[PDB]
Symmetry: C3
Subunit: 140 residues, 3 copies
C-alpha cells in the first residue's frame, strides 16, 4: 500500500550528504533513518543520546501512524536500540523526528554522521471510543 | 478510523480521580494509560513493578489488537519503559490491563497515582494460516 | 482477517518435536515461536543469544509485515525479551526467522528446546513516498 507523505528538510545536508530515508526493496516494510550529526558521538555502555534526523514529516491522515524501531543487527550484535524502545509518531506531529539512541550493551559505540541507525514503518491505526459496560458479552 | 470498544471499570477511581484514557488530539495515534495505585511506588534503577490500570477492555473484533508502548519522554529522559518492551493485547482478552514498568536507567523514579505512565494504540492485525512449501516463488 | 502464508521447514523437528507456531484462540493477535535448539542454552544476566526457529516464511504481499515481540510473562517476570526489542520481518524476506534473546534481568535463565520464547503478529504496512514541501498545511 502506498501513501505520499509531506516532508520538510530542516538541515540542508539531508537529501545530499545524509541521504533521505529510502526503502531498499519493493518488499521492505521499513525505511532506515540516518543520524544528522556534525561529528561522531561516542555512546558509552548504558547511556542514551538524542539523535536528530534533520527532517520533519506530516502524516496528516489520522488513520495512519509511524513506529520507529531498532535495526536488528545493531540491536542484536551491538546493543544499539531506542531509549524509548519503540517510537510512536502521531499523524498531526510536525516537529523534527528525533531518535533516542540507547546503548544497552557492554561496549562503547560510535554513532557516525549519516549512519543508518534506526528504522521506521507506517501502520494503519484505529482510534477507540470507550463504551462503558457493567459486563462483557498474568516458565510460560 | 474509529471503533467503539467496550470497557469495564474495575476501580471506582477510574473515570474520577484517575481519568479514563483519552486522545489528546484528533490526530493522536495512541492514548495514555494512568497508574491506578493507592500510593506512590518508588522504582529503583533496574527494577520492574506491575502497575494496575483499574480497567478491562474487550476489543472483541479478531481483526484488531492493541499495543502498549512506553511514552517517549519517560523512556528517553527517565528510562521508564516497559519490562516486556511492548505489550500485545488480544481481541479476546477480558482481564485487567496491566503495565509492566521497568526502570532501565540509573536513577530511582517515583510512579505516582494517576500519572500517565504508558500509552496504547489499536492496530489492525492479520491471522496467518501456514501453507507448507518445499520452495518459495543476519556496523550495519 | 486471515492470510495464507508460505512456510518452509528448515529443521525436520519443526512440526514434530518442536510444534509449528499456532494461535491459542480465534481471538489471539499473535502466535508463539519456539526455540529450535539441540540442547538448552543458559543465558546469563545481561547477555544476548541468537535462537533459531528452524523455519522460513514468505509473507510475499508488500502490504503486510510481521513484528516479533517478547511474551509478557517472560519479559515482566524473568526479563527475557528481544535484543533488538522488536523484530521487523519484511514481505520479501525468505531467510530463517531468527530470535535475538536478551536477558535484561538479574537472574540466569535457561532457554529450553521447544520452549515458546517469543511471539509474532502480522500487521498491514504502508510504504511512504516522500513529497518535499517548504511548509506544511520533546515528569510527562
Ligand atoms: O521516538 C520518538 C517518539 C516520538 N517522537 C515525537 C513524535 C510524536 O508524535 C511525539 C510524541 O510522542 P509520545 O507521545 O510518545 N511522547 P510524550 O508523551 O513524552 O510527549 P507528548 O506530551 O508530546 O505527548 O514525539 C519522536 O520524534 N521520536
Ligand atoms: O503489557 C501487557 C501485555 C499483555 N497483557 C495481557 C493482555 C494479553 O492479551 C495477555 C497475554 O499477553 P502475552 O501473550 O503477551 N503474555 P503470555 O504469553 O505470558 O501469557 P498467556 O499465556 O496468557 O498467553 O496479557 C497486559 O495486560 N499487559
Ligand atoms: O528479530 C528479527 C528481525 C529481523 N529478522 C530478519 C527478517 C528481516 O526481514 C531481516 C532484516 O531486518 P532489519 O532490517 O531489522 N535488520 P538489518 O537492518 O540489520 O539487516 P538488513 O541490512 O538485511 O536490512 O532480518 C529476523 O529474523 N529477526
Ligand atoms: Mg534493515
Ligand atoms: Mg504523548
Ligand atoms: Mg501469550
Amino acid at each position: 500500500m502506498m501513501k505520499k507523505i509531506d516532508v520538510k528538510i530542516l538541515d540542508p545536508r539531508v537529501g545530499k550528504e545524509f541521504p533521505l530515508p529510502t526503502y531498499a526493496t519493493s518488499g521492505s516494510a521499513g525505511l532506515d533513518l540516518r543520524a544528522c550529526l556534525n561529528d561522531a558521538v561516542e555512546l558509552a555502555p548504558g547511556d542514551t543520546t538524542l539523535v536528530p534526523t534533520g527532517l520533519a514529516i506530516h502524516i496528516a491522515d489520522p488513520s495512519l501512524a509511524a513506529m520507529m524501531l531498532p535495526r536488528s543487527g545493531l540491536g542484536h550484535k551491538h546493543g544499539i536500540v531506542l531509549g524509548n524502545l519503540v517510537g510512536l509518531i502521531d499523524s498531526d506531529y510536525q516537529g523534527q523526528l528525533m531518535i533516542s539512541v540507547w546503548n544497552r550493551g557492554q561496549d562503547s559505540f560510535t554513532i557516525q554522521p549519516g549512519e543508518r541507525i534506526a528504522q521506521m514503518i507506517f501502520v494503519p491505526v484505529v482510534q477507540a471510543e470507550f463504551n462503558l459496560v457493567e459486563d462483557f458479552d498474568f516458565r510460560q
